[PDB]
């Protein structure tokens, strides 16, 4: 009875949905894309080497204009650069020394940041003073913040180390919605292009989507081997790729609700700490911890190119909204732009 | 007319370049440390000698030491510790006395040794030397001079262990107290010297939590850490 009874009925649900997944898995992506033309060996050189940081760069984010990319490090300030002419547009100092994430609002007015201080600090950019200042300081999380994203300048989704996600309103400063159902430290959350569902991945090898309105998890996604570090949505909004600490990148399909196909190699030892897609979605991008980065053919599981411009852990990666460039930021306190 | 915005952009970029150079000086002049232990291990008493985390900035002979103690945080340390590969040292405070009575894990030294082993062999913390503080030495002496619970049956290598010839029994105490103290020290040093390849070392001490010399010990250990790093990079050590 009680705990054991619910455990056995939960196992009944588990193998029932496993049987359902096997029934709906009539084929794989490999046998349906084997006749497709491969992208071949591609290469792309560095265009700009953004420099001026001291500590390890932990995150970044482009804007809608794909011109100003944010950057955050453990030095104590967050730098808003310019992709062209490498000029440092802004530099906002931070109260806390280490931050783990940054967010660039689609309007470009607000910039979010946060880290081990357990407080999401959001700064303006177009104040009447002409300088930067603290706009909002969201508090309530008892764990470290790992990733933040912007829907508009009225709502922010923040992923914390409390094994929960949060959706806050800017002016109220309180948790409008709380997302629970996870047991490991939630690391990366990524928003769909329609800005309706966002996928979050914890330290329990499980990534699930959440709806921003009712605040309930709809579909879970298990089948990995270790803690998932980074997730990005497919450009169509019906798939998402997960990288973790086991040298694998699994592409889940939202409608199929199953593991489609996986990217790995025998020589890769370290895990993935940055996953992102291109505009067309044909090119996955993975940043490992062996001082390297690579691009994967998202439909053929064939490596198409290796980028070795960094001499430290590639902790962060980003792709412009128009798909014109790729920015990789590592523990070398550098940022590299490729195209 | 279109050149003026980029002219202002160069002027700005020069301003942040100067500000970042000043910050680079003031930040390379600042030494960061993380204090780590359990709640009963003695974090608060070491902090007392001068948000989920707390900060403490102090000066030891015109040297800016920023010591940070993690407070309201989850016990899963496998991924938020990776932020601390750039600290010059990692202060590790353990409760040497608490080896029984049944308190917390009841094998506090074993848990601390496992945590130290995980920290030492981490692929990102390999470049950070770990200052180690053996707190609660008076309590250990009182509980080991005459106690119902013996450290035996908790560690089966007490019989094959004696006081080392290089030991420093500066305070006149029982030989068993010195034996236990350097036993715990050698248990920590066994994992300290089993890996690292000279990249980082441990600096054990004996903090009684009743003296203000711990900041001086930390300052001396940081000086030794930087001296050893310079010597190794110069191909001398």
């Amino acid at each position: 009875s009680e705990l054991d009874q619910l455990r056995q009925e939960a196992e009944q649900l588990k193998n029932q949905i496993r049987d359902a997944r096997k029934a709906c898995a009539d084929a794989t992506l490999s046998q349906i894309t084997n006749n497709i033309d491969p992208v071949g060996r591609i290469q792309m050189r560095t265009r700009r080497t953004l420099r001026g940081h001291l500590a390890k760069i932990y995150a970044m984010h482009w804007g809608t204009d794909s011109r100003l990319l944010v950057s955050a490090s453990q030095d104590g300030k967050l730098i808003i650069w310019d992709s062209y002419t490498t000029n440092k547009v802004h530099a906002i100092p931070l109260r806390s020394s280490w931050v783990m994430t940054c967010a660039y609002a689609p309007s470009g007015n607000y910039v979010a940041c946060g880290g081990l201080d357990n407080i999401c600090s959001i700064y303006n950019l177009k104040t009447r003073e002409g300088n930067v200042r603290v706009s909002r300081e969201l508090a309530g999380h008892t764990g470290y913040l790992s990733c933040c994203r912007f829907l508009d300048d009225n709502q922010i989704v923040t992923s914390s180390g409390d094994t929960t996600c949060a959706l806050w309103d800017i002016e109220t400063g309180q948790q409008t919605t709380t997302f629970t159902g996870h047991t490991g430290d939630v690391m990366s959350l990524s928003l769909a292009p329609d800005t309706r569902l966002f996928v979050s991945g914890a330290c329990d090898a499980s990534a699930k989507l959440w709806d921003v309105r009712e605040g309930m998890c709809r579909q879970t996604f298990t089948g990995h081997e270790s803690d998932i570090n980074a997730i990005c949505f497919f450009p169509n909004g019906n798939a998402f790729a997960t990288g973790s600490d086991d040298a694998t990148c699994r592409l889940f399909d939202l409608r199929a609700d199953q593991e489609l196909m996986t990217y790995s190699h025998d020589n890769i030892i370290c895990g993935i700490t940055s996953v992102s897609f291109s505009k067309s979605g044909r090119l996955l991008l993975a940043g490992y911890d062996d001082f390297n980065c690579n691009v994967w053919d998202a439909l053929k599981a064939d490596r198409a190119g290796v980028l070795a411009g960094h001499d430290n852990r590639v902790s962060c990666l980003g792709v412009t909204d128009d798909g014109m460039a790729v920015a990789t930021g590592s523990w070398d306190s550098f940022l590299k732009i490729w195209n | 007319d279109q050149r003026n915005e980029e002219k202002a952009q160069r002027e700005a970029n020069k301003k942040i370049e100067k500000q970042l150079q000043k910050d680079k000086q003031v930040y390379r002049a600042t030494h960061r440390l993380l204090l780590l232990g359990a709640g009963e291990s003695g974090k608060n008493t070491i902090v007392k000698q001068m948000s989920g985390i707390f900060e403490t900035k102090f000066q030891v002979d015109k040297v800016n030491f920023h010591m940070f103690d993690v407070g309201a945080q989850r016990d899963e340390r496998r991924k938020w510790i990776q932020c601390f590969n750039d600290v010059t040292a990692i202060i590790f405070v353990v409760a040497s006395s608490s080896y029984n009575r049944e308190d917390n894990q009841t094998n506090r030294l074993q848990a601390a040794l496992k945590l130290f082993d995980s920290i030492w062999n981490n692929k990102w913390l390999r470049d950070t030397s770990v200052i180690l503080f053996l707190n609660k030495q008076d309590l250990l002496a009182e509980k080991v001079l005459a106690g119902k619970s013996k450290i035996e049956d908790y560690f089966p290598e007490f019989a094959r262990y004696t006081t080392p010839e290089d030991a420093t029994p500066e305070p006149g105490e029982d030989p068993r107290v010195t034996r236990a103290k350097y036993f715990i020290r050698d248990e920590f040093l066994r994992i300290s010297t089993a890996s690292g390849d000279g990249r980082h070392y441990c600096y054990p001490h004996f903090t009684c939590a009743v003296d203000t010399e711990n900041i001086r010990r930390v300052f001396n250990d940081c000086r030794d850490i930087i001296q050893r790093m310079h010597l190794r990079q110069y191909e001398l050590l």
Partner: nanobody, 128 residues
Framework: QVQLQESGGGLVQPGGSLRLSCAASGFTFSNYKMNWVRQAPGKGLEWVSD????????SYTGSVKGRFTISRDNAKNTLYLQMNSLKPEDTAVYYC?????????????????????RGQGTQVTVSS
């Protein structure tokens, strides 16, 4: 998904012998360090023992050193623990823990509460 199922155990007279079998499914067993942990009733967790990827490196808690034997087998992906000469102090629940990352010498959160990759474990009680 990672699944660790622990079998064996039960009520056994003190001074006897006992075995636990931890079956691991959903991942590669020949790549992850294995850990056995215990939790006493009304007390915190306590790490029992650990074994490396190939079984070369074996370490035990000093209290159980010489009486516990941990052996892993990667062919059928199973981790066995043998207890000899039980004592009434060793009444506890036992979990078959897991290394967080492949090819990694360290092991961080085996004794941490609400660990993700921890099995249900078995309750072993020794008394009269």
């Amino acid at each position: 998904q990672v699944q660790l199922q622990e079998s064996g155990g039960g009520l056994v007279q003190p001074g006897g012998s006992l075995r636990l079998s931890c079956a691991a499914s959903g991942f590669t067993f020949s790549n992850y360090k294995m850990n056995w942990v215990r939790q006493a009733p009304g007390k915190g967790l306590e790490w029992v023992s650990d074994i490396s990827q190939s079984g070369a490196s074996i370490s035990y808690t000093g209290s159980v050193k010489g009486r516990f034997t941990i052996s892993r087998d990667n062919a059928k992906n199973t981790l066995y623990l043998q207890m000899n000469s039980l004592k009434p102090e060793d009444t506890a629940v036992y979990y078959c823990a897991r290394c967080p990352a492949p090819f990694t010498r360290d092991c961080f959160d085996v004794t941490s509460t609400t660990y993700a990759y921890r099995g249900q474990g078995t309750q072993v009680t020794v008394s009269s």
